[PDB]
Amino acid sequence: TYVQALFDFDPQEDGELGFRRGDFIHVMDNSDPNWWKGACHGQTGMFPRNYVTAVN
């Protein structure tokens, strides 16, 4: 399950996943409707659902 970043996300709190617009993120736990958890650049962390889009 993959998504792609719609915007840069600059993390502010421990647990927040940093990424740039266009990056692909591997979704690991999307149980929360608001904040998904996944992996990018060799880290796990959480980020808002609405900062990404699902991809194929």
Binding site: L6, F7, D8, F9, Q12, E13, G15, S31, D32, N34, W35, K37, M46, P48, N50, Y51
Partner: peptide
């Protein structure tokens, strides 16, 4: 085009 507001009170670690 603008990034959405980030809603940290909704974070699942809270």
């Amino acid at each position: 085009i603008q990034p959405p507001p980030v809603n940290r009170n909704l974070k699942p670690d809270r």
